[PDB]
Amino acid sequence: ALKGDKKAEVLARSLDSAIDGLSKGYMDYQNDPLLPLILSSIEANVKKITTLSA
Amino acid sequence: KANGQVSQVIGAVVDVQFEGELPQILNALEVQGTQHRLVLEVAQHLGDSRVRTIAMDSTEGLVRGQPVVDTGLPISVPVGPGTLGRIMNVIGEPIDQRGPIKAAKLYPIHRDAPSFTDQATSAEILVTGIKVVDLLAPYARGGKIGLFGGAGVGKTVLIQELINNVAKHHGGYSVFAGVGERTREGNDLYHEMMDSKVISVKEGESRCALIFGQMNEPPGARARVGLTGLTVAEYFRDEEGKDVLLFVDNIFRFTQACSEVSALLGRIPSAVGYQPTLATDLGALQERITTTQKGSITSVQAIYVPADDLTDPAPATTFAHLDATTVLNRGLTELGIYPAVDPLDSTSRMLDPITIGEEHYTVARGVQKLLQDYKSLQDIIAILGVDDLSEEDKLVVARARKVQKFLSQPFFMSEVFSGIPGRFVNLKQNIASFKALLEGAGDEYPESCFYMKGDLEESLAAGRADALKS
Amino acid sequence: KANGQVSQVIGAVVDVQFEGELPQILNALEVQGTQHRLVLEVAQHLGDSRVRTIAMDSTEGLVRGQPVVDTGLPISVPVGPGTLGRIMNVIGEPIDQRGPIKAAKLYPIHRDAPSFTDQATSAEILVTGIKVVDLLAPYARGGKIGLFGGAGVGKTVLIQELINNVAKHHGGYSVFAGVGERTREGNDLYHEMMDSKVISVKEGESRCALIFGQMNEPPGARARVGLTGLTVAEYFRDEEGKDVLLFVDNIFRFTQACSEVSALLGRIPSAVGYQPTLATDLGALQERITTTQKGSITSVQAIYVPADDLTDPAPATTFAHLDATTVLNRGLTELGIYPAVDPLDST
Amino acid sequence: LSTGEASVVLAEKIKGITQQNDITEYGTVISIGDGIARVFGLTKVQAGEMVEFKSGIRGMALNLETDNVGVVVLGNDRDIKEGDVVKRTGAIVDVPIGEAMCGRVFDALGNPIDGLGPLKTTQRARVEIKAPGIIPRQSVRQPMQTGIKCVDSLVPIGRGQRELIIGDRQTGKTAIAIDTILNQKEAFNTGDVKKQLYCIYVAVGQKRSTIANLVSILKQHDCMKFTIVVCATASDAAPLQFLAPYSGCAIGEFFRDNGKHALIIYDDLSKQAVAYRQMSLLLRRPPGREAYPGDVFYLHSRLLERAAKMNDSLGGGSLTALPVIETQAGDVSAYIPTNVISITDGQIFLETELFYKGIRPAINVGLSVSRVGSAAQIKAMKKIAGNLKLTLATYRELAAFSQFGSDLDAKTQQQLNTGERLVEMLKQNQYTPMKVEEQVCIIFAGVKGFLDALVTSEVLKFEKKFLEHVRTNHSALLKRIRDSGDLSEVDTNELNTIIPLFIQEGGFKLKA
Amino acid sequence: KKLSTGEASVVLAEKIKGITQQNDITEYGTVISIGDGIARVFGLTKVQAGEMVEFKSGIRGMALNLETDNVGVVVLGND
Amino acid sequence: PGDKPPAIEDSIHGKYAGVLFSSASSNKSLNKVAEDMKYFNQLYKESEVFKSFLNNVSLKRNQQRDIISALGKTNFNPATNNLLETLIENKRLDSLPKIAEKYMDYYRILNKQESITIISAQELTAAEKQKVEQGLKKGNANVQFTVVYQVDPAILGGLQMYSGNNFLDCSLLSRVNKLKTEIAKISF
Ligand SMILES: Nc1ncnc2c1ncn2[C@@H]1O[C@H](COP(=O)(O)OP(=O)(O)OP(=O)(O)O)[C@@H](O)[C@H]1O
Ligand SMILES: Nc1ncnc2c1ncn2[C@@H]1O[C@H](COP(=O)(O)OP(=O)(O)O)[C@@H](O)[C@H]1O
Ligand SMILES: Nc1ncnc2c1ncn2[C@@H]1O[C@H](COP(=O)(O)OP(=O)(O)O)[C@@H](O)[C@H]1O
Ligand SMILES: [Mg+2]
Ligand SMILES: [Mg+2]
Ligand SMILES: [Mg+2]
């Protein structure tokens, strides 16, 4: 994700989240795409492993 | 309403900036917003409405601009029977976990010493049960008492035995202020007083108060907790003409704490790194520990001698304030003798033929001459041997070894180390025992029987028993 | 561009005032308008754009307001096989009159010590030929060695014997760094090396490098020449990987030098006049003299004991870094025993 | 737990990751030198609070002055420049604690320098905290077996006490600590939790090569699985050497407060005092005697007073400290040694003369002492230790007469011989810790006088041979002495019979 | 330099204000700092070395250091 | 404003500036003295002789007094004149510049206007900058401010605001580091 190949929305999403944090006293990454992006890969792998006990 | 605010924080020294009506020196300031009650003792006026103070607790967590409240009085601690049987802090906080302390009033730890006209000195023998002390360096009821010792010679064990022997069966109250010493010893003493029923949970009993400013506490606390214990005793003395026993575990820690902050306070260091105000700081405390017309205070304080250097400024200056002095020697420990009371160096202002019986004075001087003569011979004995000595010198050496071993006495508090039960020796029996040894009463028996025995009769019986055993 | 100007000169300590873009600490600055180029390593940022520095050469002749140039990098000395058979200065200048040194690169004399993960035991004995040493305190190749001795007990002679017995037959490269020693000994060693065939003018030979910051040099020079020599050895250890022999004629001088300048830097003196940063500075230099996975460095360090007082802070702090110790006693010299090695104190 | 179920838990855990950022006041550096940074502004900063520079290195705010703030750089200060930014984290110095620490090597701050992997822990404890009060503590009544015969018998160490290993350079100070750590290994392998003792080794001002050799030794004996090594080497900044002992002690308080037992070994505290002196002098604080700050005693006391034996109400945990002190020329009259002796309970004196005369461990029994005394030793131990002590004193007294007088009486000759055999028996090799029960058998053979028969040069080998014989043939006896911890009369008779018998059977030099 | 104890903020403020009132500087002094039984006093000029001075409370002091901007006095009593 | 300077410091220049601030703010005026002190600062760096005069210490007190009068006896608030006289008497004239600077600092602290600096890797488009102003406004919403921009970081897509003495990090670089660290400590 740090690389190119659909990194534009990340910087755009960060700008939106950053303006929010500036607008507010603190900063929370409620809308950052990194966490959902990582979760997508991990959920795919988890779904892949969750087949059956056998 | 907080007028001041923190401006500078270095170590335990804190500077405060005030807007108006600066507090007198020695007053107590309360810092607001701390998780624990933090108190500051005013030490200097720097000008511009600034005061330099010493913190009683850790300064970690302070912040510049933090409001400070002026109490308008020096550190006041609760006094009265409410402190009896309860562990208390330097500022009066209860650290026993048994609840708040009930006090008729709060007294300040700083006060002017009693006048000269109301000194009211008096000499009266104090039977400690320790034959060496009762013989060579008698203690005086109502007079100061010093135990000078290095590291690990047995002055802590000696304090415990005096408590067991004197504190109990004492009409008046007793105070124990332990400043600078280790916390493990504090727990042991508390449990021991509880077992011995000197203190109890049941109210109306527990005739003893405890104050602890142990190592873990930062400087300023170790420097003022001694005054706190002394203030409790002064109330018990003045308000009630009751004999008070003040046990101060090492007081050298008091001057040490002062020197730890003297530099940051701006003072120039003295000869051995101590503060310039060593004598006056110490004398202000000693003069308050005295018997007066109203009541009497019997103070037993332990002075730690660093590196066994009796010329150190702290103990050297303390010597002048003490009525009775007990110097512990490390060489005796190597020999196995306990207590390691140097018979020659130990002195007592009460060792006078008028105060005590002439026979007592005569017996003591004979022992001292005997031991000193033996010490002189040791040199030539090394080169020539005991054989080449004359019969007179041989008798001196033999009797001196027996006397030196007979000086050893097993105390209750020492059983765990040795395994032999403690023993108590009366004054009459002690004088007679040593008087008999001088006459040659025991020159027959082996010197081994005069070891860790209470009285001469007990020692002679043990010798005869060992013979029939073999 | 010469953005700086000399603000104040105090012995070997020089302050410099800059307009902007202050150099990092330990960076090297070059003073302009002075023969015998003068280098100054930044030591402190005093505030208000003033930096206090140490001079490597004599400061006599400096004028307040004189310009100063910022190199932007710490003292960088040439390293490589070109140093072999060549005498170098604390700042890499050749003092053998052999021409410019050919070096692949220039390494900075200030570097962090090797980590905990890069450390090697290498417990293999090094036979010096000296029965007392080999018997009581045997040296371990790849380990640190320290010779402790007072004035004139046989430290320099012992160093020469080790070179004769160990260095010559040695296979890998060698590095001799002299810190605050008599220049005559440097001349004698150079010619003795040429004679022994250990070094020659012919290229491709001379498996030994020489560094000298001898007494005549001012402070700051005797304090960094050790780092310069140490760097020449680190290159051989890491890049070449071969074994290295690092000889250090007395290292105490290094400490001493720093002391002589500490007071001028505004530091409060330590116990007997030494600087408060004695142990840390010494450790930063010593932690780099060690064997790693890349290569081994067998270091022989001579330690001068001032007034025969082993309790002095310098040698006392040095004891902890050494693997093998050889303490020379003056009483034995009176008895005629040479080498005057104290078997009971040499661990 | 199924792998899929575990993976789902892991994914959910990764999901619930919070990260908040708040406005943190920052200041500028007025000056920087020798690792000390004078900072402007940065108000509302707490004393001892941590601050972060631009590069990412931390700093500790010690001096709060009306004008500036005095910060100590916890690392290398080359990147720091005038006008740089200093951001306050808002939290006092702390370190990660837990069980995952065991088997790793950290620095003062807690960062792992092993290279194995990041530290998987969630608990962070403040480094400087008030020591336990008088009530929480409890009397010390459990033995901490070092494995050294001389120590376990003459200078018993009880869990929760503080013993000072004091001596000169190259007298075997570090060897005792390493041997102690090895002895603990047997308890961990066997499932007896009541005797497990986590060992913490704090290395202050030591060459990394030495620590690496030590870790390799620990791995060799597999004793590293329960050991924690905190490293503040000579190259490290002075503040790190100052905080490492406190950092290690906090790691130990974890076990203490959690009903466990921990042994923390502070390498030379003299080196920590030097670092504190350096850090304080550079802060322009007025120096004391030997240039040490006035409150050096408070430094060591606040550290060592932490070690305690908590009461059963809090778990009965304990932290045992073995601080090390290096003396210059055997003068324990120095400033720092004097303070520490007054702080600790007992001290183990190491002498160089004894070391080279063959007495290794070079322990001076005449000076060594323990406050706890026999309260820590086991029942089977105290009985023998008393007679052993009495025998040692007599031997020392008669040593001088024999050399010059050159005439020995039958009674004196026997006492002289008996003491010599015991001294040879107390000798012990390095990296060879002995079980407590085996110590009892060997010390028993000595005090009872059996060793007086065989030649001194054979006493040490008889120890090895006889111990093996006991482990093989007489294993129930050892189990009794171990479990019960007492030497019954039946065991006394059984042991008293086989000792002389074995001496006569095996091939030894019987002439005294 | 570092500073001078005679440069107190209160004394300096009066100079900046421009009001030349010293409340009889001679034979009268105002305490500037007190510590360890030593009081520094601004003013109090015309005071002889080794002379006794009376404080507001009543305790006396001895002028031992006659400095340019202040007088170092040792208080003869509790500080 | 309570005749109390922003900060209290024991340094020489700090002590004098605080007294001047208090005294000036006491009678009525601070802005008048500000121009006087600001004038001295500009002169100290622009006029070479004036700088040499101040630093010159071999000069007598009377000589210093006459030269100062020649500069100007009016256009300086009475507090400033009294301050110069005091400095001459106390040999502190050399520190006059620092005092000036220090004073203005305090004055600039009383100034409500502040400069905010934003650090971002990507170049800030004018439309984006307007949104940033709206956010900073909504954050403060009660104080006017001047914005400054700076783009030369290693962070990406992140904004870091510096406001005088406060720092707020919304950088994505922080998020990256935090996640990589927490994922390591999972302790599965
Ligand atoms: N029981 C022992 N038996 C035989 N040799 C021993 C014994 N103990 C230590 N030695 C030797 O003592 C030397 C190291 O002693 P050690 O490092 O343990 O003490 P130290 O005080 O830590 O020394 P240093 O001050 O250099 O750190 C080694 O040469 C070791 O072989
Ligand atoms: N009467 C005694 N008999 C036998 N051993 C003793 C005796 N007194 C002390 N010891 C020993 O002395 C040591 C205690 O010394 P201590 O009184 O605590 O002095 P300090 O207060 O300075 O530490 C203990 O090891 C203790 O075992
Ligand atoms: N092996 C030796 N045999 C005989 N004399 C020696 C020997 N070593 C040294 N000497 C003497 O030691 C003296 C000094 O040696 P040196 O190592 O230079 O001392 P320093 O440590 O001061 O440099 C020599 O002048 C020499 O006279
Ligand atoms: Mg004690
Ligand atoms: Mg030489
Ligand atoms: Mg060691």
PDB file of N, CA, C and O in Angstrom, chain B residues 148-187:
ATOM      1  N   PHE B 148      27.537   3.915  69.996  1.00  0.00           N
ATOM      2  CA  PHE B 148      28.378   4.150  68.836  1.00  0.00           C
ATOM      3  C   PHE B 148      28.838   2.809  68.295  1.00  0.00           C
ATOM      4  O   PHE B 148      29.441   2.012  69.020  1.00  0.00           O
ATOM      5  N   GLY B 149      28.556   2.565  67.032  1.00  0.00           N
ATOM      6  CA  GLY B 149      28.899   1.303  66.412  1.00  0.00           C
ATOM      7  C   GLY B 149      29.096   1.472  64.929  1.00  0.00           C
ATOM      8  O   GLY B 149      28.517   2.365  64.305  1.00  0.00           O
ATOM      9  N   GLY B 150      29.923   0.612  64.363  1.00  0.00           N
ATOM     10  CA  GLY B 150      30.076   0.546  62.931  1.00  0.00           C
ATOM     11  C   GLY B 150      29.006  -0.326  62.314  1.00  0.00           C
ATOM     12  O   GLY B 150      27.950  -0.579  62.899  1.00  0.00           O
ATOM     13  N   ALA B 151      29.290  -0.791  61.108  1.00  0.00           N
ATOM     14  CA  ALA B 151      28.361  -1.638  60.376  1.00  0.00           C
ATOM     15  C   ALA B 151      28.420  -3.069  60.894  1.00  0.00           C
ATOM     16  O   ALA B 151      29.452  -3.739  60.776  1.00  0.00           O
ATOM     17  N   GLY B 152      27.315  -3.532  61.464  1.00  0.00           N
ATOM     18  CA  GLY B 152      27.185  -4.910  61.892  1.00  0.00           C
ATOM     19  C   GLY B 152      28.009  -5.319  63.090  1.00  0.00           C
ATOM     20  O   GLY B 152      28.697  -6.342  63.060  1.00  0.00           O
ATOM     21  N   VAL B 153      27.940  -4.526  64.154  1.00  0.00           N
ATOM     22  CA  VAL B 153      28.583  -4.860  65.419  1.00  0.00           C
ATOM     23  C   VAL B 153      27.581  -5.235  66.495  1.00  0.00           C
ATOM     24  O   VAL B 153      27.987  -5.779  67.535  1.00  0.00           O
ATOM     25  N   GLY B 154      26.303  -4.965  66.289  1.00  0.00           N
ATOM     26  CA  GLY B 154      25.263  -5.379  67.194  1.00  0.00           C
ATOM     27  C   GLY B 154      24.544  -4.282  67.949  1.00  0.00           C
ATOM     28  O   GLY B 154      23.999  -4.559  69.023  1.00  0.00           O
ATOM     29  N   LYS B 155      24.515  -3.056  67.432  1.00  0.00           N
ATOM     30  CA  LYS B 155      23.796  -1.999  68.129  1.00  0.00           C
ATOM     31  C   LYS B 155      22.295  -2.095  67.911  1.00  0.00           C
ATOM     32  O   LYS B 155      21.520  -1.651  68.763  1.00  0.00           O
ATOM     33  N   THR B 156      21.869  -2.662  66.786  1.00  0.00           N
ATOM     34  CA  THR B 156      20.447  -2.884  66.572  1.00  0.00           C
ATOM     35  C   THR B 156      19.914  -3.956  67.512  1.00  0.00           C
ATOM     36  O   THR B 156      18.842  -3.796  68.104  1.00  0.00           O
ATOM     37  N   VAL B 157      20.649  -5.058  67.656  1.00  0.00           N
ATOM     38  CA  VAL B 157      20.268  -6.096  68.608  1.00  0.00           C
ATOM     39  C   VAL B 157      20.237  -5.542  70.024  1.00  0.00           C
ATOM     40  O   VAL B 157      19.382  -5.912  70.835  1.00  0.00           O
ATOM     41  N   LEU B 158      21.174  -4.653  70.342  1.00  0.00           N
ATOM     42  CA  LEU B 158      21.223  -4.069  71.675  1.00  0.00           C
ATOM     43  C   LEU B 158      20.009  -3.197  71.948  1.00  0.00           C
ATOM     44  O   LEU B 158      19.489  -3.181  73.068  1.00  0.00           O
ATOM     45  N   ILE B 159      19.542  -2.466  70.939  1.00  0.00           N
ATOM     46  CA  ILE B 159      18.345  -1.653  71.112  1.00  0.00           C
ATOM     47  C   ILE B 159      17.142  -2.535  71.406  1.00  0.00           C
ATOM     48  O   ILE B 159      16.314  -2.216  72.265  1.00  0.00           O
ATOM     49  N   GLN B 160      17.026  -3.655  70.696  1.00  0.00           N
ATOM     50  CA  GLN B 160      15.923  -4.575  70.941  1.00  0.00           C
ATOM     51  C   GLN B 160      15.955  -5.126  72.359  1.00  0.00           C
ATOM     52  O   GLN B 160      14.910  -5.251  73.008  1.00  0.00           O
ATOM     53  N   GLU B 161      17.141  -5.464  72.858  1.00  0.00           N
ATOM     54  CA  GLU B 161      17.240  -6.002  74.209  1.00  0.00           C
ATOM     55  C   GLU B 161      16.889  -4.965  75.264  1.00  0.00           C
ATOM     56  O   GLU B 161      16.219  -5.281  76.252  1.00  0.00           O
ATOM     57  N   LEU B 162      17.330  -3.725  75.077  1.00  0.00           N
ATOM     58  CA  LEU B 162      16.958  -2.675  76.015  1.00  0.00           C
ATOM     59  C   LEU B 162      15.451  -2.508  76.059  1.00  0.00           C
ATOM     60  O   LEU B 162      14.867  -2.311  77.129  1.00  0.00           O
ATOM     61  N   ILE B 163      14.807  -2.578  74.899  1.00  0.00           N
ATOM     62  CA  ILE B 163      13.353  -2.519  74.854  1.00  0.00           C
ATOM     63  C   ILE B 163      12.762  -3.672  75.649  1.00  0.00           C
ATOM     64  O   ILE B 163      11.907  -3.479  76.520  1.00  0.00           O
ATOM     65  N   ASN B 164      13.225  -4.889  75.374  1.00  0.00           N
ATOM     66  CA  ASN B 164      12.689  -6.055  76.064  1.00  0.00           C
ATOM     67  C   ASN B 164      12.913  -5.953  77.564  1.00  0.00           C
ATOM     68  O   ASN B 164      12.067  -6.379  78.358  1.00  0.00           O
ATOM     69  N   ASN B 165      14.046  -5.390  77.969  1.00  0.00           N
ATOM     70  CA  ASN B 165      14.446  -5.374  79.367  1.00  0.00           C
ATOM     71  C   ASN B 165      13.930  -4.158  80.118  1.00  0.00           C
ATOM     72  O   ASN B 165      13.652  -4.256  81.319  1.00  0.00           O
ATOM     73  N   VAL B 166      13.805  -3.019  79.449  1.00  0.00           N
ATOM     74  CA  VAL B 166      13.438  -1.763  80.087  1.00  0.00           C
ATOM     75  C   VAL B 166      12.035  -1.326  79.690  1.00  0.00           C
ATOM     76  O   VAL B 166      11.219  -0.981  80.545  1.00  0.00           O
ATOM     77  N   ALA B 167      11.738  -1.327  78.389  1.00  0.00           N
ATOM     78  CA  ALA B 167      10.433  -0.868  77.927  1.00  0.00           C
ATOM     79  C   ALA B 167       9.314  -1.566  78.682  1.00  0.00           C
ATOM     80  O   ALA B 167       8.429  -0.918  79.250  1.00  0.00           O
ATOM     81  N   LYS B 168       9.338  -2.893  78.696  1.00  0.00           N
ATOM     82  CA  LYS B 168       8.379  -3.637  79.490  1.00  0.00           C
ATOM     83  C   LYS B 168       8.594  -3.354  80.969  1.00  0.00           C
ATOM     84  O   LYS B 168       9.706  -3.062  81.416  1.00  0.00           O
ATOM     85  N   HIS B 169       7.513  -3.453  81.732  1.00  0.00           N
ATOM     86  CA  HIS B 169       7.549  -3.214  83.168  1.00  0.00           C
ATOM     87  C   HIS B 169       8.009  -1.794  83.472  1.00  0.00           C
ATOM     88  O   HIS B 169       8.675  -1.542  84.478  1.00  0.00           O
ATOM     89  N   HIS B 170       7.654  -0.863  82.592  1.00  0.00           N
ATOM     90  CA  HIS B 170       7.985   0.546  82.735  1.00  0.00           C
ATOM     91  C   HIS B 170       6.682   1.315  82.874  1.00  0.00           C
ATOM     92  O   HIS B 170       5.832   1.264  81.980  1.00  0.00           O
ATOM     93  N   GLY B 171       6.522   2.015  83.996  1.00  0.00           N
ATOM     94  CA  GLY B 171       5.264   2.697  84.249  1.00  0.00           C
ATOM     95  C   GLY B 171       4.887   3.654  83.138  1.00  0.00           C
ATOM     96  O   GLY B 171       3.750   3.657  82.658  1.00  0.00           O
ATOM     97  N   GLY B 172       5.836   4.479  82.712  1.00  0.00           N
ATOM     98  CA  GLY B 172       5.583   5.458  81.683  1.00  0.00           C
ATOM     99  C   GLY B 172       5.498   4.856  80.297  1.00  0.00           C
ATOM    100  O   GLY B 172       5.548   3.644  80.095  1.00  0.00           O
ATOM    101  N   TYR B 173       5.361   5.742  79.320  1.00  0.00           N
ATOM    102  CA  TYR B 173       5.298   5.367  77.921  1.00  0.00           C
ATOM    103  C   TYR B 173       6.687   5.334  77.297  1.00  0.00           C
ATOM    104  O   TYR B 173       7.674   5.788  77.877  1.00  0.00           O
ATOM    105  N   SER B 174       6.748   4.783  76.090  1.00  0.00           N
ATOM    106  CA  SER B 174       7.984   4.660  75.339  1.00  0.00           C
ATOM    107  C   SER B 174       7.739   5.065  73.897  1.00  0.00           C
ATOM    108  O   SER B 174       6.658   4.827  73.354  1.00  0.00           O
ATOM    109  N   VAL B 175       8.738   5.688  73.288  1.00  0.00           N
ATOM    110  CA  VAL B 175       8.689   6.073  71.887  1.00  0.00           C
ATOM    111  C   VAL B 175       9.867   5.445  71.162  1.00  0.00           C
ATOM    112  O   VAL B 175      10.972   5.368  71.708  1.00  0.00           O
ATOM    113  N   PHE B 176       9.628   5.000  69.933  1.00  0.00           N
ATOM    114  CA  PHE B 176      10.676   4.463  69.076  1.00  0.00           C
ATOM    115  C   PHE B 176      10.607   5.173  67.735  1.00  0.00           C
ATOM    116  O   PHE B 176       9.678   4.949  66.956  1.00  0.00           O
ATOM    117  N   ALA B 177      11.595   6.011  67.466  1.00  0.00           N
ATOM    118  CA  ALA B 177      11.722   6.717  66.202  1.00  0.00           C
ATOM    119  C   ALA B 177      12.906   6.119  65.458  1.00  0.00           C
ATOM    120  O   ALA B 177      14.053   6.263  65.889  1.00  0.00           O
ATOM    121  N   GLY B 178      12.625   5.456  64.345  1.00  0.00           N
ATOM    122  CA  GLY B 178      13.665   4.857  63.541  1.00  0.00           C
ATOM    123  C   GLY B 178      13.875   5.646  62.274  1.00  0.00           C
ATOM    124  O   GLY B 178      13.026   5.633  61.379  1.00  0.00           O
ATOM    125  N   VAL B 179      15.000   6.347  62.190  1.00  0.00           N
ATOM    126  CA  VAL B 179      15.277   7.249  61.085  1.00  0.00           C
ATOM    127  C   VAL B 179      16.433   6.682  60.279  1.00  0.00           C
ATOM    128  O   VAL B 179      17.497   6.384  60.832  1.00  0.00           O
ATOM    129  N   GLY B 180      16.218   6.507  58.979  1.00  0.00           N
ATOM    130  CA  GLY B 180      17.264   6.087  58.082  1.00  0.00           C
ATOM    131  C   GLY B 180      17.527   4.604  58.020  1.00  0.00           C
ATOM    132  O   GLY B 180      18.207   4.152  57.093  1.00  0.00           O
ATOM    133  N   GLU B 181      17.032   3.830  58.973  1.00  0.00           N
ATOM    134  CA  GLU B 181      17.328   2.410  58.995  1.00  0.00           C
ATOM    135  C   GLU B 181      16.469   1.659  57.986  1.00  0.00           C
ATOM    136  O   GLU B 181      15.584   2.216  57.336  1.00  0.00           O
ATOM    137  N   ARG B 182      16.761   0.373  57.851  1.00  0.00           N
ATOM    138  CA  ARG B 182      16.102  -0.451  56.855  1.00  0.00           C
ATOM    139  C   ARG B 182      14.685  -0.796  57.288  1.00  0.00           C
ATOM    140  O   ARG B 182      14.359  -0.819  58.478  1.00  0.00           O
ATOM    141  N   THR B 183      13.838  -1.066  56.296  1.00  0.00           N
ATOM    142  CA  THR B 183      12.427  -1.312  56.550  1.00  0.00           C
ATOM    143  C   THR B 183      12.178  -2.715  57.082  1.00  0.00           C
ATOM    144  O   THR B 183      11.221  -2.929  57.832  1.00  0.00           O
ATOM    145  N   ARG B 184      13.016  -3.676  56.698  1.00  0.00           N
ATOM    146  CA  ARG B 184      12.881  -5.033  57.214  1.00  0.00           C
ATOM    147  C   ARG B 184      12.950  -5.054  58.735  1.00  0.00           C
ATOM    148  O   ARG B 184      12.152  -5.734  59.389  1.00  0.00           O
ATOM    149  N   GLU B 185      13.893  -4.315  59.315  1.00  0.00           N
ATOM    150  CA  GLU B 185      13.994  -4.247  60.766  1.00  0.00           C
ATOM    151  C   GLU B 185      12.738  -3.646  61.381  1.00  0.00           C
ATOM    152  O   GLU B 185      12.319  -4.045  62.472  1.00  0.00           O
ATOM    153  N   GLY B 186      12.127  -2.683  60.695  1.00  0.00           N
ATOM    154  CA  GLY B 186      10.901  -2.092  61.203  1.00  0.00           C
ATOM    155  C   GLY B 186       9.771  -3.091  61.337  1.00  0.00           C
ATOM    156  O   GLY B 186       9.061  -3.107  62.345  1.00  0.00           O
ATOM    157  N   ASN B 187       9.582  -3.936  60.325  1.00  0.00           N
ATOM    158  CA  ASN B 187       8.541  -4.952  60.403  1.00  0.00           C
ATOM    159  C   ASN B 187       8.795  -5.919  61.547  1.00  0.00           C
ATOM    160  O   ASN B 187       7.867  -6.298  62.270  1.00  0.00           O
TER     161      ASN B 187
END
